[model samples]
Target: NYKNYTVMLVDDEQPILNSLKRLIKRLGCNIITFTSPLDALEALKGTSVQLVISDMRMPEMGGEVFLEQVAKSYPDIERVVISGYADAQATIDAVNRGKISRFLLKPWEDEDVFKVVEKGLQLAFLREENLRLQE
Candidate 1:
């Protein structure tokens, strides 16, 4: 079944952010866009974000740096990287670094994006629930 989840879309590019915002809204979910990765990162510290979809190469902080912080500070939140076609190295590093559940290539298909976001959102809920149960 489909569900609504809070998604944080981070990128230095306004066009991409707006596009993603519309896409997320169309699916009936809430979205927050941040142009500065650092601002996004700060918001992450408090947001109940189920999914963090971020651009790999940002001006302030790269996706790698953000993912590592997420893993360290917010391991319960699921991570996804949107890499431009040329970001093979970043994708590789993300996998090696761990925390990133999926690395989606940019110019991604609409259907694929929805599918990944759905799955990632579910996983985030499960992980967060499991952690809470442990406490």
Candidate 2:
């Protein structure tokens, strides 16, 4: 139904990962799911992941820190943070420190997640186009 973009989905929990993966796959984008943050980080270095969606409470590293690293290493890649827990400070810090594009709560609704993916791809392509034009 639309252009296919690449996205990296990272989560320590398989249950959470499975559901999100299915919804995202239905949206028509290519997705790579990673249970290990370290693995995802390594893959991102060589892969051109346009957007990243990660769970906030992973064991390898908190999603905020992972997102921070992603922003530092791959500034062009858009980032989204997901969490099943509702921690006010963490959510604030994720936005302020992680610089996440969106803070999605767990048990995400189909329409909401779809809209996020739609906007993420839109922004990713817009950024790529701008960079291309600049070059």
Candidate 3:
């Protein structure tokens, strides 16, 4: 169980957000969902999220742009993208700019989602550990 970890998910579709929440909830991590990328970024100001999973296309802001800002603002947070095959180029750009750790394709599998969460949390822990040691 990843009770100590907090994951933020941003997707414009409510059903997608709800589905993601349900999948991640089983792992026992704190899950926060936002239908708007802008709201998600605003929420991050006050919350300490270890990982962020975002949808590639949104009306408010593209996932690449949103993750880019997060990467700039919170360098330690792990970033992941949920996108379709059509957004492969954009997702690649996001990975380069945002240092995205992983990507979950549309119609994702339950096992894959679990693996991504576990891996992201592990990476997050190591990042914080390295920072603490540096200090």
Candidate 4:
């Protein structure tokens, strides 16, 4: 069950965040939404999350930089990046530098976004299981 699983959602647009929150709420994870990257980062300090879904074009900090910090600070957390504009280079850079687990363009269908989240959860569970087994 995803009852206790948590996800950090970061985006500058309220509309996008609201839609995505509605779309993924069914997964049963605690979705924490933030319109500011700095605010999200502040929350992260006191909370542990299974996943992080961020937008590329934020006012204060870009997704690449945000996710990059996440990768270093919370290596166990999985990351996803969603954007409306197509910037292949920027996407590639995030993938390489930010360690994003998946990239989905905006205007995304519900099913596609759901699939990515489901897979992310699965991977997160598997990693935790592996670590437990090792210990």
Candidate 5:
């Protein structure tokens, strides 16, 4: 159903990235994974991604910085943040700084993940359409 969409996921942990990839594959969107936020940003320059879900804490660059950069460069792309329950303060900071659309906790439910992805994609599409219509 999401064949026309592409989603990029960034996490410092390989296992978490793999698990997310597995869970999201069922939605039928093109999925790209990156263990490094820097690499993800580099790839974004040449790739057409509609939605991005990133982890809050990364060694190279925090999700706040990564998402903020994306927001600046690719305003139409929808962004989501992933954080642990214990990182409430950091998560809030990221949300404010990155202009995140949605966020998922570390122990995310399958249904919640699917809902977030679906909504993010929808919002991205809407934003793109709005921009096109304005022009």
Candidate 6:
């Protein structure tokens, strides 16, 4: 059972964060949500979270800036960027800057978002398993 994997959810919008948490919970996984990227970062200290999904246009830091920091500090976490706007350039910038694993557009289809998260979790498990096997 892949019971230990944890997902960190961040968005400045409380309603969006709530919806995302509910949607993610439907997949039967543990999740931590934060409306402030700074607060999320504080929670991350000495804590292990395997995956992170953030919104692009936050009131502060923004998704790309926040995820870039996350990529540097928590390299193990799978990162995803979700945005309500069709900002392809921003998504590319995030990818190029090592800020995200994938980009998802907002008003996202539930099935599509779930598939993206499931895939990330699967990849995370593979990496963890491979590391253990090597050790």
RMSD of 6: 1.9
Task: Please provide, for model 4 over 13-57, each residue's C-alpha lDDT reduced to its tens digit, 9 standing for 90 to 100.
Answer: 899888998988988789999999999999999997888899998
> What lDDT would each prediction earn against the true structure?
0.81, 0.83, 0.87, 0.85, 0.87, 0.84
After superposition on all C-alphas, the RMSD of every candidate to the true structure, in Å, is 2.7, 2.3, 2.3, 2.0, 2.3, 1.9
lDDT for model 3: 0.87
- Model 6 residue 135 lDDT score: 30
TM-score of each model, in listed order: 0.88, 0.90, 0.91, 0.90, 0.91, 0.90
How many residue pairs clash (N, CA or C atoms closer than 3 angstroms) in each of the candidate models, in the order given? 0, 0, 0, 0, 0, 0
Q: List residue ranges in candidate 5 displaced over 4 A.
A: 131-135
lDDT of 6 by residue, 17-100 (tens): 888888888888889999999998999996788789998988878899898888888777788989656777888777776778
- Model with the higher TM-score, candidate 1 or 4: 4
Per-residue CA lDDT of model 2 for 32-82, tens digit only, reads 999999999999878888889888888988888899999898887889888
Clashing pairs in 6: none
Write model 5 residue lDDT over 43-108, tens digit each, in one string. 998999999999988999878888889999999999998978877998887766656877898798
Q: Supply the global lDDT for candidate 2.
A: 0.83
Question: Which sequence of candidate numbers ranks them by lDDT, best first?
Answer: 5, 3, 4, 6, 2, 1
Candidate no. 3 TM-score: 0.91
Model 1 segments beyond 4 Å from truth?
1-4, 131-135
Clashing pairs in 1: none
Clash pairs, model 3 backbone = none
Candidate 3, position 121, lDDT: 87
